Amino acid sequence: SCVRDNSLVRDISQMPQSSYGIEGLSHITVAGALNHGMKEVEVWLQTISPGQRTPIHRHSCEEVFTVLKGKGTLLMGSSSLKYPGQPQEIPFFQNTTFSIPVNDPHQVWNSDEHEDLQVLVIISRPPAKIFLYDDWSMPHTAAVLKFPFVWDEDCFEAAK
Amino acid sequence: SCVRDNSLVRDISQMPQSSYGIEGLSHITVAGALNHGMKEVEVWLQTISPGQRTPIHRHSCEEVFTVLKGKGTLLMGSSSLKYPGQPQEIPFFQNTTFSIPVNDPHQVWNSDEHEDLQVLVIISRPPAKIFLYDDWSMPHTAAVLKFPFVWDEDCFEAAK
Numbered sequence: 401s402c403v404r405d406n407s408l409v410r411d412i413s414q415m416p417q418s419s420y421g422i423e424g425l426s427h428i429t430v431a432g433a434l435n436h437g438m439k440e441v442e443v444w445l446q447t448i449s450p451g452q453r454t455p456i457h458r459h460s461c462e463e464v465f466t467v468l469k470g471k472g473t474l475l476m477g478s479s480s481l482k483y484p485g486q487p488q489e490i491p492f493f494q495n496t497t498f499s500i501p502v503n504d505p506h507q508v509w510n511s512d513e514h515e516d517l518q519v520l521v522i523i524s525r526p527p528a529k530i531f532l533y534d535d536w537s538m539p540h541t542a543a544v545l546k547f548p549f550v551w552d553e554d555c556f557e558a559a560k
Numbered sequence: 561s562c563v564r565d566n567s568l569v570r571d572i573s574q575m576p577q578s579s580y581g582i583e584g585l586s587h588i589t590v591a592g593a594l595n596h597g598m599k600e601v602e603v604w605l606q607t608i609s610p611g612q613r614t615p616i617h618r619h620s621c622e623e624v625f626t627v628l629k630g631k632g633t634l635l636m637g638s639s640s641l642k643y644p645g646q647p648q649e650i651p652f653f654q655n656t657t658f659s660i661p662v663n664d665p666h667q668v669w670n671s672d673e674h675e676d677l678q679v680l681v682i683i684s685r686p687p688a689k690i691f692l693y694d695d696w697s698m699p700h701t702a703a704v705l706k707f708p709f710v711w712d713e714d715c716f717e718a719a720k
């Protein structure tokens with residue numbers, strides 16, 4: 401169900417979390433467009449289980465991650481080639497931050513075997529317009545837009 | 561000092577931290593316009609000591625707080641009448657979030673007697689253009705622009 405909250409101060413621990421089908425993910429939309437009426441920034445809290453990954457994707461917005469707990473590897477592909485290509489692998493750890501250049505293909509992986517990875521994520525121009533890649537070899541022109549994204553599907557249908 | 565860095569993964573524990581002369585404040589720009597090249601979002605990490613208050617201010621941007629540690633009181637006035645008016649005073653605590661509507665005059669007060677309040681603050685349209693009120697009866701047209709704000713001064717001067 402779509403959970404909307406017009407309240408000013410909200411307890412994040414009482415905002416409903418779900419994997420939405422992404423195995424090993426736990427997502428909460430802390431302050432968003434469809435759930436709370438944001439227009440310029442939207443904030444997520446996500447936990448990713450040991451060894452799990454976000455899909456390979458891009459989005460036309462800025463995106464900033466702040467690592468609250470755990471560690472992992474950020475996989476970055478090319479925006480200059482016609483496809484992402486074999487990715488650069490950049491380790492990250494607790495209390496680091498990283499900004500994804502607008503539109504770059506990337507993937508976040510909990511490469512740690514021992515503990516959960518928890519990140520606060522912020523995007524501009526919400527809600528998110530995510531294009532999914534099946535692999536680093538897939539051309540940018542073939543990536544598929546999945547809008548609404550899984551955590552917006554309920555409110556997007558509800559708004560109709 | 562102005563510490564520029566566009567490095568993709570950055571360690572928050574090593575970034576410059578200062579009160580910038582604001583008693584009881586501790587500030588780090590985690591991801592910002594002038595320091596790091598952001599264009600649409602900017603993230604601050606701030607610690608506010610017991611009993612301290614931010615100035616009463618407004619800024620024409622969205623702004624979302626997430627409370628990492630501690631508790632406090634949010635004071636909010638209106639942007640539609642000629643002055644802010646007697647403010648709403650809403651308690652907040654660890655793991656809560658609040659978003660300030662565009663241009664609402666507000667104040668964040670660490671009303672706890674003993675613990676530090678630590679918040680992540682996210683803003684749109686950076687850097688911040690903050691207008692300061694001396695009290696809740698000061699008319700909106702009289703509020704004073706302080707730009708650049710103290711944590712942007714050094715990098716603002718260096719980017720001329």
Ligand SMILES: *[C@@H]1O[C@H](CO)[C@@H](O[C@@H]2O[C@H](CO)[C@@H](O[C@@H]3O[C@H](CO[C@H]4O[C@H](CO[C@H]5O[C@H](CO)[C@@H](O)[C@H](O)[C@@H]5O)[C@@H](O)[C@H](O[C@H]5O[C@H](CO)[C@@H](O)[C@H](O)[C@@H]5O)[C@@H]4O)[C@@H](O)[C@H](O)[C@@H]3O)[C@H](O)[C@H]2NC(C)=O)[C@H](O)[C@H]1NC(C)=O
Nearest residue numbers: 412413417418419423424425426427428445446447449655
């Ligand atoms: C502010 O409040 C925040 C909200 O409460 C809080 O953050 C929450 O903190 C809790 C406590 O640590 C976290 O809970 C932890 O979640 C992780 C990660 O979870 C997900 O992955 C698991 C593990 O998975 C794999 O193996 C299982 C076998 O069990 C398979 O099924 C699976 O396919 C994988 O191979 C998975 O089971 C989870 O799934 C279920 O749960 C989701 C949602 O809960 C449902 O949608 C789903 O259908 C089913 O119920 C899920 O995908 C887990 O690994 C830990 O053991 C523990 O549960 C929350 O994740 C975390 N929330 C977020 C959004 O981060 C903050 O910590 C708090 N902060 C402060 C400052 O106080």
Ligand SMILES: *[C@@H]1O[C@H](CO)[C@@H](O[C@@H]2O[C@H](CO)[C@@H](O[C@@H]3O[C@H](CO[C@H]4O[C@H](CO[C@H]5O[C@H](CO)[C@@H](O)[C@H](O)[C@@H]5O)[C@@H](O)[C@H](O[C@H]5O[C@H](CO)[C@@H](O)[C@H](O)[C@@H]5O)[C@@H]4O)[C@@H](O)[C@H](O)[C@@H]3O)[C@H](O)[C@H]2NC(C)=O)[C@H](O)[C@H]1NC(C)=O
Nearest residue numbers: 495572573577578579583584585586587588605606607609
């Ligand atoms: C990710 O990394 C982050 C960065 O390391 C980290 O966050 C930092 O965490 C540390 C450790 O907990 C915090 O340090 C604590 O800071 C508090 C608050 O400090 C400020 O207030 C004090 C107290 O002020 C009042 O009392 C004094 C008298 O003692 C009076 O003078 C004053 O007027 C008030 O009445 C004040 O002394 C502090 O000032 C000094 O320090 C600043 C630098 O911060 C100088 O600029 C200043 O000139 C002067 O030397 C300051 O105003 C302090 O009370 C604690 O004792 C301790 O120092 C950091 O604040 C915090 N940083 C931020 C930005 O939040 C994260 O926790 C880490 N996260 C993870 C997950 O690991």
Ligand SMILES: [Zn+2]
Nearest residue numbers: 457459463500
């Ligand atoms: Zn992304």
Ligand SMILES: [Zn+2]
Nearest residue numbers: 619623660666
């Ligand atoms: Zn503010």
